[model samples]
Target chain A: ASMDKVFSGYYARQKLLERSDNPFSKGIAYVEGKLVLPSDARIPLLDEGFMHSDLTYDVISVWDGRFFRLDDHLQRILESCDKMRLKFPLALSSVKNILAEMVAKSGIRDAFVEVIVTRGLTGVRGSKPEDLYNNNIYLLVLPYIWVMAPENQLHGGEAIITRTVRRTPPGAFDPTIKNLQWGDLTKGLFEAMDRGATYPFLTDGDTNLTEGSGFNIVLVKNGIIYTPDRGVLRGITRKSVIDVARANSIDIRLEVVPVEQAYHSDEIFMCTTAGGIMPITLLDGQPVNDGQVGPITKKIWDGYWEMHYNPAYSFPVDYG
Target chain B: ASMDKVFSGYYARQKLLERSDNPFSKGIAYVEGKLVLPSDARIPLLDEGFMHSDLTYDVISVWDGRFFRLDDHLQRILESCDKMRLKFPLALSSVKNILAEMVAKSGIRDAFVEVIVTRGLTGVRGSKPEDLYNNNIYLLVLPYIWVMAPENQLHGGEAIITRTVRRTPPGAFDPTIKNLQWGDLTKGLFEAMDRGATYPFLTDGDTNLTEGSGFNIVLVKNGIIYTPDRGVLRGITRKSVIDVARANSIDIRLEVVPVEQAYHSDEIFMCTTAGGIMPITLLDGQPVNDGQVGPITKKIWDGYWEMHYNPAYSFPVDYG
Candidate 1:
């Protein structure tokens, strides 16, 4: 998640990322099954996906010129479609080809790529979700993102365990999949911002911890890594850290993390593809002990950079 | 809401409502702060509103050339903006003026006027919610809609109380906001649709009935009306129904309605801006009480229709 590389053309002028990149540049745009300019990419006013949040999407990264966990992101989106009963007009392979073409056209070396599958326009606008069909897919390539810029990483970050909101429990909605229905997540953002915290962690009704706004949260105590057993997005970045822990022989467990557990934990970290692993040095403006990154968090952080720059796990997006 | 209205110029040839709306059509469109044709209405793909469901909206109705509860709809939307801390680029009155003119131009006397305020394009793309901002509002008018066709309302309908998914509880998100987030609601739709039910009503983790997929669920027993005390969007139609009950000296109470309560209810009806009122005569294939719309339900149903067409309650839209 290093922001060393950037795009040419529009992005380079705006400094959207290191070496300069703009979010809206010469990226590929697919509008209603047709390939068009990035600026021309748009959907109908009555698209059920936009109107009712009947959509699912995923963001994959091109780090060091290779796609990071592309398959995981795609698979999760497909599952969301199946669960939502949304119709995908084409095969997974075909969409990948389109995504690859979009990346190739965007001509960005290292960046974040987003793919959206919308429920399309409901034949006539209504609240009935059953009539939602003609699902459409959109692809966009933008500058790289970071959970915390490199500067913030060195000093660690701050967070607020907010009681103002709770995570949508398992039965209400699946947190494992990447989705566009982000009202709760947005609300969490508002609360966290007001409290002057860099990130907000929410609970699951009972004061037991669930997840950060969008990232999966982990806590480290006595050299062991712990995350919530449920009620959190199971992102690819989370998988990377857990895998690294096992290979490196560090104890990593998935269990219910109560607010007290987090407060008492020796160290805490936030994980996401965009932000590899960011340490939370402050909770509610109080230092996590002395506000320095812990040894275990340092290992995972170093472990992430190793994998990101390595080709074994990071696959290349087809630009040919 | 009724299906008698149709979009003019292009849609007058075919039915715009009912089973005839094919999703794709030329109605009306506005873009970049200017009025365009319907097909040209497109939003930037990276809009946080569509990409992240970081949006809240309200659907208001026009019946017999009059707008229904116009003030309440506007009040709800403004409150959502305030709660979201969204900077509405224009004053409330200006937007209402635009909505009225949009309807007036569409030339549809009886239709749905949808007003959407999008948290515009993110300055950059990332999973972090705080950076997602630059809100923009979009409005469009289309033909009227209903949960069930006018014919189905006469005989009442059937519903499936889906245990597979739950209504998102209070703290997860503001249940009162009409938001674009519908992952759970969409899941509820899939379940209800598969079970061959008219609508899907969801309960909390505690088996307490909360809401229908997009409508408010109300239960009637022994001439008393009951609805969920929490965990539901307080739809304008639901408010109208409750107001009618109070004015008419009928019993209507807000309480935690359980699945068992639904099964025992003599009458069940759904309410939303789209579907004014629809009786649920059956629950899980078993008849709701005697499998008919009870007299109390009938009274409320008639009351809604009376209010909908009344010149006093249904203020006329300026379609000159």
Candidate 2:
């Protein structure tokens, strides 16, 4: 009840303000109770920042028959924030307890929880250490619906190949901060939308297939699975799917996938914190490998669901 | 008197709060009723906030040099702000009136006027544009220092070729907006400092010697004057020098100057709003044109000074 009131109040105030004219406000949603919108939204438990390293929070619920790997996600989020020189505020246990209490009070059995930390208010100009004092923490919950085929597994989604290239270089800003700045992703999305595709895959300047705007790309060729080298945010669902594949005796390779090879790949799929293992039926409008979800992707989804629903696998500490 | 109080009070506050992190603090200094800074501060005009089109404001209480073509500089600044989507809050006539009154009140024979505009407070993110506000308008006065060498009118200062590269691409963000986002210049300065050069001449990615970090690069080879193709800020003083040179029967060419040619040019000099025509003495620590001010450079400087101090030359609208 308290979480609902706090989050909804912020959302009400946010709705009265004008949207930012800046380029970075994409994929950001505010979550108020079960509602999701630009003013309030929720992120999956597997999303980064689901756990609190300062022992402040825990997971509160699960959605689509999966409990997010909260601890692993939190650790990764902390690592990313440190790389960006941003401070994370809440302790792990406190965040976990807060999420659990909120979820229990809200009585949401299948839903999404969101948390974000922002550098708070400060003066506009100059590079100074004190400017780092601006910090913010946000959390909320929202209704989540999972689409499944008759077999009770991910139906898989398609991706459109795009000309938009990743500008990040290795050792530059890490790709995992999950900051609200998503200009590159917006550019890629617009390009894909123009071509009538719902989702788009991007590549490095050198034509190596990197990933989708918000998801990781995986390819199954012959009997092995290949994905991009770890220069990007290792998506939580991406790691889960990879683990599922490994458990099923599938060989995994991390390497560069050229655009030319991506067209001829036997099967393609995407992974993210929300979308488990989505099949890539199209690349730049051309059907990929008969434009169907492959057996490997299906196996990953089935294995993920089986482990996700097992009660013996306790919820992550951050998820209260 | 109220305006004077505001100006004096702002300056005092600036002195107390000027830190590397607080760029909006009164960074401009009024010297002898002319806009100037302490002698030790290199690059006196802070370049931040020059990019936002809406941040335009007016300078007060300073002599408008009866220099030829002062209006051109004012018009250029206005035009640049317009192109960059920044607004000029102060009226042109009012700005001129303020400058005239300030000069009359100070009774300073030679005064420099500086105007600065910065985006005021916005949301936490840098890219978003919310309510538009002018960060501050700084008006300072100082005595005008002769920025040209008398001998250089007859002989140009030796030019130093630098290895630093400019990152701006033509047809992207226009170079005319004289904003403070000058990371590229800082990089060039560091590069020149490392090589023991006083000033560095930079080239864009296309191998064209664009301009100095703050000054326009001019070249002379075989009795013909040449400069880089235009994408650089058209300096007020640079135009004056060009006009003076053309009036003296000197031919000018705007073309790309390769690094090799810049190093081996017959003569070279730089021009800016403050510096009329400063002869370069070295390139990457190597002597340019025997490390001496050349004959043509001296001729141009002398002609410029004559135009600057001539009583017949009507003071621009701001001072007349």
Candidate 3:
């Protein structure tokens, strides 16, 4: 099938998902130069990545057969590796080819692509980190995921300001580096489940707002947009949304936001690669500015989606 | 071979290490009832354990064919699972049998055994924590490990008080859970390497000491023993050392320990399942007290080792 025939829109993508001729149709992965089903990809038992959570990963989404903000995601993962002192095993060009190859092999046009770099196996038991710098890169392509369903994204979703859990302070480990240390986040998830909320938003020691699980939070009060300046993933979609607001002449500020501001905001939304602009209508069961998707949110969300097809921002995968 | 004939002492262990008969002689593992080489153990690509570091584990060491403090380690891991809300797939008795079977299969009498329970694979993409509680238990047995070599343990080792990193606050996620989230600990290791130390000791936001990469810190000022009461792993060895100290009439205190106290301490040591009673002689390039192993450290260290063989604390593996 031609690229357009296979990936023009939702209908084409659904047809592609229904095909089973290719064993890697649902998901495909690349590890150590070998391609396999994502479920079959494995790491050694003692890989420091698995052992010490000593690894970094980046998530990029493919929409309409084109990678959205691919360069930004790649750059961010490299920066994450630099902070963790984890070396990427391959050149950037090579990594890109592997990602495209996996997407092409899977034939999943709209895909959730994960690029991981792990501190490879130690030389011997209890080897020092300096001696175990050898690293491994893994690529996985699966059907695109949504943090909140499309209906929730259009209307808005409910979240709680967890009284029990707090964000891991940046001093502990830079949240800017997207490592696999989600102990705090996972615990907050349980709290969210217990409280009957879709997700939990954690605060820092001083009651300062931080990012939610897997997404960055934004608030609109009056006509201005605000996001936490520190303790976040430095999300690609977040940057794009900020840029979208700028292009539309909307004022956005990055500074410390108090948890109180969340309940008082006129509009609230989340941004991440998994979900573009997700409206949060309810905060701790209280209505967020009339509990509807606000005008600014709709404007930015629509603008963000349009940027996916912009020639400079998105890269089309070469199926050939 | 009979258990005694194969696991008599260090000499017998060396012979076992050299044998080529059993494929699992060096190491063995159990996952889903299949026993394989430790290196061969694998989890699915999207297992929440690997994805979000949503797993709990406990490490127990076997010495001279006997498992030291097996009951304590087992109890701690169960508590960890409880805290993380991860369920063990089998009964405690069945899990114990599996551990013994793996040890017997490997024929490595002196070994590092790890028991891990991971929040298993999510039900579907972007599944909620409520629907993804199915947990997986894994067992691995390898040759014993030492945080610091035997030489370092005896004469003393060096460590730096890290200036850049801090412990993840207990409020974020209870450190007592002993989960696989070691991002902060791993970063401290890099700082230690750059500072020319064997390991780095992290402090809390208030400059209160927390823990090392995989061990708990203990300090002796004048005559009293002290260890930080919070933001630590609740180590079995730490408890054992405290008990040994109490039995010997050496008063030990579990309370807040400021970073300043580390520099002022008369003697310093670290404790963990990987190593017991490791004396730290050099602190930030200065001598810890007299720069030699202190007398009290020796007494407590000896007492702790003696307890390893005590019948009440040790369980012999059934190699039947």
lDDT of 3 by residue, B1-320 (tens): 12223224555566767775778878888876787777677766767678877788999998777899888988998888887777777899888878887887777778899988887777323566567668887788988877876656657999899988888889887989987788888778888888898878999879799998989999999899999999888999999988889898999999999999999999999998886778999999899999998878887787877786789888788766
TM-score of candidate 2 relative to the true fold? 0.50
Local accuracy of candidate 3 as per-residue lDDT tens digits, A65-100 = 899988899999889988888787789998888889
Scanning candidate 3 chain B in windows of ten residues, the lowest lDDT window is B1-10
* Best prediction by lDDT: 3
Q: Regarding DockQ, does 1 or 3 come out ahead?
A: 3
After superposition, the stretches of candidate 2 with alpha carbons farther than 4 Å from their true spots are: A1-61, A64-67, A122-125, A130-134, A145-156, A164-167, A310-320, B1-320
lDDT of each: 0.74, 0.52, 0.83
- Model 2, B250-308: lDDT tens per residue? 98876666766776777778876454567876666566677776777767766765565
Of all native A–B interface contacts, model 2 reproduces a fraction of 0.00
Q: Candidate 2 chain A — worst ten consecutive residues by lDDT sum?
A: A46-55
Q: Is candidate 2 or candidate 3 better by TM-score?
A: 3
Off by over 4 Å in 1: A1-26, A33-40, A87-89, A122-133, A316-320, B1-29, B37-39, B123-133, B309-311, B318-320
**Candidate 3 B-chain TM-score:** 0.93
Q: Which of the two, 1 or 2, has more lDDT?
A: 1
DockQ-better candidate, 2 vs 3: 3
The candidates, ranked best first by lDDT, are 3, 1, 2
Pairs clashing within candidate 3: none
